[PDB]
Amino acid sequence: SMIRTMLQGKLHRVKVTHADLHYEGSACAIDQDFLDAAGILENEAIDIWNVTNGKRFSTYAIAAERGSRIISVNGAAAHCASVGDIVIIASFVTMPDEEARTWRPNVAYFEGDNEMK
Amino acid sequence: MIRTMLQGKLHRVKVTHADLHYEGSACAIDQDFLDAAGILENEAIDIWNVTNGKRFSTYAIAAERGSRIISVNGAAAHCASVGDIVIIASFVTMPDEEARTWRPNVAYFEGDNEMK
Amino acid sequence: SMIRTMLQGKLHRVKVTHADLHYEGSACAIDQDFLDAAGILENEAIDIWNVTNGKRFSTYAIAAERGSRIISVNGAAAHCASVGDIVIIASFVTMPDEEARTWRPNVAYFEGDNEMK
Amino acid sequence: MIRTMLQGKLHRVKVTHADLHYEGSACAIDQDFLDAAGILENEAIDIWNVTNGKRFSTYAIAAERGSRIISVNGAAAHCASVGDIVIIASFVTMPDEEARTWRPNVAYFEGDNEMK
């Protein structure tokens, strides 16, 4: 009956590839392959921690083309990240305490040209 | 596991009223807009300001249907001015299996809060 | 199965009566009578919107003595509110959509010397 | 209705490590402290900085038990420095009826992160 909020998964230190300098559009668009590795769903709430500038903000994920390696921060969120910035993108899920106690988040690590693992 | 998913949003509406001496804290929204985005009276919402980048949270109430109003008359007026473009969103939870096919309710706007 | 986050209740425009100038203690302590009127529980998460200075922060409620009319912002939260500031204190609850569609929040309105109603 | 309630907290621990060139985003916490406050590995937490008033959110991981460590080595280092006093909290949900008698797990500290 008591329900925990747990890290579901994250993209650890991916690089922002696009940020609408016009603040058009919405959401953070993410290569479907990266969503798959982190267990993140289209339209799922996400938290973004910008390691480069310290900004922390929340939005939702949408899928970019598989293999594009895109991390695109659009809309209002382009006020909080720029091309080249290193970010951690996380989703959180809820579950009962017993499940939470053995829960393992899905983590994808990145380097270079948004190369996963 | 239970996911948090985008229920719906108003994509790029303008703030229409923002006098910080109205006393409230809610964002009052044309009921036609609430209907399109599936947002409820008294539902938590997030507001993302496209003009100034400020991001904040409050709850929704109805403004007259047809009025096209987006009002942060009240406390939320520290975060938006009239003419500012914003995105207003709400989020819901549901089991993972349902979340995988979930479709948010999105309303798009042009000009003077005209729904497309 | 789809679950909404709804305003449970709020204290509308109460005045802060104490704010640890030392940043000691924790939480926001609230006259039990006010908690009762707003449907807010001891240890419940609350959002505070400071109408005087525009600051928005989240913490948890604890009960102050019934009839004390206390609104005390302690700990880190005294960095965000001062004695005399006008605040709105809200709690949010989750429930299914059908229940959300006819839900009525508990609202307590204040004036003067934290006089309710 | 489902309430959000304070599950537990570490009341006035000091940040012990905060080098922003460690690359992470989590807050690493002595397992003895996690045990006392009921906070889990990978659980969302809120951190409230008593020294500078900054408030932020991340998740918990274990540091060695006995180490007395509170580490924001990583991204959260923009929000706290070593020697800063913080409160670390987690929140859980449960039905209203259970929430009415819920008791959070609170650990109090003195001096050099010594649990009382």
DSSP of chain D: -EEEEEEEEEEEEEP-B--TTS---SEEEEHHHHHHHTPPTTBEEEEEETTT--EEEEEEEEE-TTS--EE--SGGGGT--TT-EEEEEEEEEEEHHHHTT---EEEEEETTTEE-
Contact B79, B21 (CB under 8 A): no
CA distance B46 to B55: 7
Tell me which residues of C are annotated as active site: 26, 60
Q: Which residue has the tokens 């938590």?
A: B44
Yes or no: say if A58 and B6 are a contact pair by the CB < 8 Å rule. Answer: no
Tokens, residue C64: 């102050």
Q: Which two tokens stand for residue B57?
A: 């949270």
| Residue with token string 């949010």 | C92
CB pairs under 8 A between B and C: 63
How was this model experimentally determined? X-ray
Subunit partners of chain D (3 or more CB pairs within 8 A): A, C
Collapsed DSSP state (helix, strand, coil) of residue C89 = strand
- Chain C, nearest residue to D104 by Cα: C43
Asked if D51 is an interface residue toward chain C (Cβ–Cβ < 8 A), one would say: yes
The answer for residues whose C-beta is within 8 angstroms of residue D101's C-beta and 6 or more apart is none
Which residue among D23, D40, D74 sits closest to A4, beta carbon to beta carbon? D40
Alpha-carbon distance A16 to B18, whole Å?
34
Smallest Cα distance from C60 to chain D, Å = 7
| Structure-block tokens of residue A20 | 């609408």
Q: Is B3 within 8 Å of B104 (Cβ atoms)? A: no
The whole-angstrom separation of Cα A57 and Cα B87 is: 14
Å between D75 CA and nearest CA of chain C:
21
Inter-chain touch D6–C43, beta carbons under 8 Å: yes
Contact C54 B78 (CB under 8 A): yes
Identify any residues that bridge with B70 across adjacent strands, giving them in sequence order.
B29
Length of chain A in terms of residues written: 117
Q: Report the candidate in A40, A75, A70 with the shortest Cα–Cα distance to residue A57.
A: A75
C neighbour chains, 3+ CB pairs within 8 Å: B, D
Which tokens in the block code for residue B11? 């994509």
DSSP string, A38-88: HTPPTTBEEEEEETTT--EEEEEEEEEPTT---EEE-GGGGGT--TT-EEE
In contact, D21 and D84? CB cutoff 8 Å: no
Residue D95: how many other CB atoms lie within 10 Å? 14
Domains and CATH numbers, chain C: 1-117 (2.40.40.20)
Task: Chain B: give the shortest CA distance to residue C88, in Å.
Answer: 8
Q: What angle do CA C5, B103, C104 make, to 5 degrees?
A: 25
> Would an 8 Å CB–CB cutoff place B40 in contact with chain C?
yes
Go through A24-41 and write b for each residue having 16 or more CB atoms within 10 A of its CB, e for each that does not: ebbbbbbbbbbbebbbbb
Give the list of residues 6+ apart from residue A112 with CB closer than 8 angstroms, or none: none
Q: A45 and B100 in contact by Cβ < 8 A? A: no
D94 touches chain A (CB under 8 A): yes
Residue the block writes with tokens 């204040």: C110
Which class for C78: exposed (0-12), middle (13-18), buried (19 or more C-beta within 10 A)? buried
User: Residue A17: what residue type?
Assistant: T
- CA–CA gap between residue A44 and residue A53 (Å, rounded): 24
* CA D23 centroid distance within chain: 19
| Cβ neighbours for B15, distance < 8 A, ≥ 6 positions apart | B70, B71, B72, B80, B81, B82, B83, B84, B85, B86
Is A6 at the interface with chain D, CB within 8 A? yes
The active-site residue out of D25, D67, D90, D108 is D25
Q: Cα–Cα distance between B57 and B47 in angstroms, integer? A: 6
Parallel/antiparallel/unpaired status of strands D70-71 and D27-30: antiparallel
Coil, helix or strand for A115?
A: strand
Structure tokens at D54: 């900054």
Q: Is position D25 annotated as part of the catalytic site?
A: yes
Mark yes or no for CB contact D99/C41 under 8 Å.
yes
**Residue A20: DSSP 8-state:** -
C47 at D interface, C-beta within 8 A: no
DSSP per-residue string spanning C24-73: -S-SEEEEHHHHHHHTPPTTBEEEEEETTT--EEEEEEEEEPTT---EEE
Query: Closest residue of C to D103, CA-based?
Result: C43
What residue type is assigned to position A70 of the chain?
I
* Chain C residue with Cα closest to D9: C26
Tell me the C-alpha to C-alpha distance, in Å, between residue D10 and each of C91, D21, D104: 23, 25, 11
Resolution (A): 2.0
> What sign does the dihedral B37-B42-B44-B50 (CA atoms) show?
positive
Q: Is B23 touching C (CB cutoff 8 A)?
A: yes
Strands D114-115 and B55-63: what pairing?
unpaired
Three state DSSP letters for chain B:
CEEEEEEEEEEEEECCECCCCCCCCCEEEEHHHHHHHCCCCCEEEEEEECCCCCEEEEEEEEECCCCCCEECCCHHHHCCCCCCEEEEEEEEEEEHHHHCCCCCEEEEEECCCEEC
Q: Cβ of A23 under 8 Å from any chain D Cβ?
A: no
Query: Do A20 and A77 contact (CB within 8 A), yes or no?
Result: no
Q: Which residues contact A24 (CB under 8 A, 6 or more apart)?
A: A74, A75
User: What's CA C97's distance to the chain center, in Å?
Assistant: 25
The pair phi, psi for residue D90, each rounded to 5°, is: -125, 160
Residue A76, CA distances (Å) to A19, B85, C61, D35 in order: 10, 9, 32, 40
Q: Identify which of C91, A60, B7, C23 has the alpha carbon closest to the alpha carbon of residue D91.
A: C91
Q: Whose CA is closest to C69, among C21, C17, C25, C11?
A: C17
Residue A25 annotated as lining a ligand binding site:
no
Q: With CA atoms as reference, report the closest residue to C86 among C9, C7, C8, C11.
A: C11
**Minimal Cα–Cα distance from A68 to chain B, Å?**
22
Candidates C106, C49, C66; CA nearest to B25 is C49
C-alpha distances in Å from residue C39, one per residue of A13, A50, B42, B74, C89: 42, 37, 15, 23, 12
Residue of D nearest to A92 (CA): D44
| Distance to chain D for C62, nearest Cα, Å | 11
Q: Give residue B64's identity as a one-letter amino acid code.
A: E
Query: How far is A80 from A94, CA to CA, in rounded Å?
Result: 27
Q: Which residues of A touch D40 (CB under 8 A)?
A: 4, 6, 100-101
How far apart CA C72 and CA C19 sit, in angstroms, is 6
Among A23, A26, A58, A109, the one annotated catalytic: A26
Rounded distance between C-alpha atoms, residue B71 and residue B30, angstroms = 9
Q: Which chains would you list as touching B if contact means 3+ CB atom pairs under 8 Å?
A: A, C
- The total number of residues shown for chain C amounts to 117
Interface contact D59, partner A, CB < 8 A: yes
